[PDB]
Symmetry: C2
Subunit: 318 residues, 2 copies
């Protein structure tokens, strides 16, 4: 367990104790209140790669839901399909799901699809998993939202048997396997991160999964949780490192000197204070932080250039 990802390329480039690495959230577009055009995503993902970003993150959403307040509906395109597309256009940057909804996607399909992605793009796949909250998706798939916490635990256990075992015995409320086997298998373990609380208690995501991803919070607010969580990780698996990940909305000011101002799910700031912010996050124990540029006042292309030229050298790929 201490050596779990010892020779995992994507993992080691992204995560190390006391180090922070930077990622980007699809859509790389400042669409704000309107639907994204989805233009230039390939070029922008390639630039993010050149600049030394270590991860590109997608979301898992089926239906456009007027109740939900997400004009992007994830990124319009199906998560797995679009992840495949963008990964096929780049050489080394990691692609991560934020998050694969285990109560809405059958664990066997998750396993099959992740295993094939890891075969097509070895050691470049990060699996963020959650219990889900797109009410319209639940309703359309005929899955109960109320018992998603139970379904999540059941799905997670099934996902790990079927991904990593040769002809396992699986008796589950989700299905049965006695005599059949998953192919392909991923070449190495796939780093699997619990997203949010996923209706579990902290004990649970200390003991299961390979790390924790939580919502954008101020560093004062986040430090406590990271600390508690790591104490529990230390109880259950002494001397292992498990990384902490979080998203952040950024509205990067034209003026490098503009002061850091809290906005919805992140900060409006100039590059100087952003660097300061990220160093703070790094010190409280954040290991990878990925930037959502959706609400920025400047086009994402210029913001991405400024970040790559001025910010990434302070938080380089490992």
């Amino acid at each position: 367990h201490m050596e779990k990802f010892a020779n995992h390329f994507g993992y080691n480039r992204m995560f190390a104790k006391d180090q922070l690495t930077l990622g980007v959230h699809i859509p790389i577009e400042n669409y704000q209140f309107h639907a994204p055009t989805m233009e230039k995503q390939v070029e922008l993902v390639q630039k993010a790669e050149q600049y030394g970003f270590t991860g590109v993150w997608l979301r898992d959403v089926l239906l456009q839901d007027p109740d939900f307040g997400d004009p992007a509906t994830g990124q319009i395109y199906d998560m797995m399909i679009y992840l495949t597309y963008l990964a096929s256009k780049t050489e080394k940057i990691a692609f991560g799901t934020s998050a694969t909804v285990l109560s809405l996607r059958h664990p066997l399909r998750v396993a099959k699809e992740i295993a094939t992605l890891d075969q097509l793009f070895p050691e470049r796949i990060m699996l963020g998993v959650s219990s889900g909250d797109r009410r319209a998706d639940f309703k359309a798939l005929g899955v109960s939202h109320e018992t998603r916490g139970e379904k999540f635990r059941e799905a997670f256990a099934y996902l790990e048997e079927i991904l990593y075992k040769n002809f396992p015995s699986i008796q589950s409320t989700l299905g049965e396997v006695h005599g059949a086997n998953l192919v392909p298998k991923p070449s190495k373990r796939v780093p699997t991160f619990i997203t949010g609380f996923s209706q579990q208690n902290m004990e649970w995501f200390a003991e299961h999964g390979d790390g924790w991803m939580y919502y954008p919070r101020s560093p004062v607010h986040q430090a406590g949780a990271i600390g508690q969580w790591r104490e529990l990780v230390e109880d259950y698996h002494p001397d292992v490192f498990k990384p902490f990940i979080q998203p952040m909305h950024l509205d990067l000011s034209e003026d490098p000197n503009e002061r850091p101002t809290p906005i919805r799910l992140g900060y409006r700031t100039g590059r100087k204070a952003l660097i300061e912010l990220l160093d703070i996050y790094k010190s409280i124990g954040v290991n990878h932080l990925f930037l959502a540029l959706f609400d920025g006042q400047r086009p994402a292309d210029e913001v991405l250039d400024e970040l790559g030229e001025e910010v990434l050298p302070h938080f380089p790929a490992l």
Copy 2:
């Protein structure tokens, strides 16, 4: 009537009384052992160069020893691998043979197909079926016995979620009332019933855009094609719907060698293959896709021979 009048992939592949050729993934003669999956991008690119109009994949989750399929479809997930191969080609159509509607939720099928058509406009053929991998049914908790019922239900849901804005759908599979599917395909997606899918002929004459059946000899296949078309003429007068056929091929070094049977196809030299394909064309086959899994020769060299010598006789439309 003019349903696919301006659909690039459909019109390149399909026309009344014409036949085009396609190829089955894995393009490899793996025979009894699991395929290495090597060189698939190269070969699909060559297939495109040569004028094959479509590339086909199967929908299989688990390796099941009792099924007798060393490839387990093509090892990789169909949707993911299709995306990948389509991302490396410019124009050849990709087809599912077949998307199992009793095993994939119609909403996921719609989302994935609509995404694929957005990324690769007019290059996606949706072959659709009620399924036969028992181990998949078990593992997914779906009853095999009732798959025909589920197929009709899923098929209906699929066509409402794909093509209606803010539809109102009540189904045993779930409900849409208020929400909407993004993205949508930019044009209708050609959708084909494969096998009988536990339906009767009248059903797949009235539903879908065409029919794909199993490897039969031309004599054994001709009757079904004519019957089906007659029913198709009953429900939608003057509309053309294509018939699609897979076939296994063991292409002999010797171009003069006459056909002998192999499982699901023929061992044959190219000269007799061309003859055979003309018969298929005359009984009403519009697309035939070749599986090279069991050939004695490696697939690259067979592909070149087909490309250079057989494809000019059955060119892309």
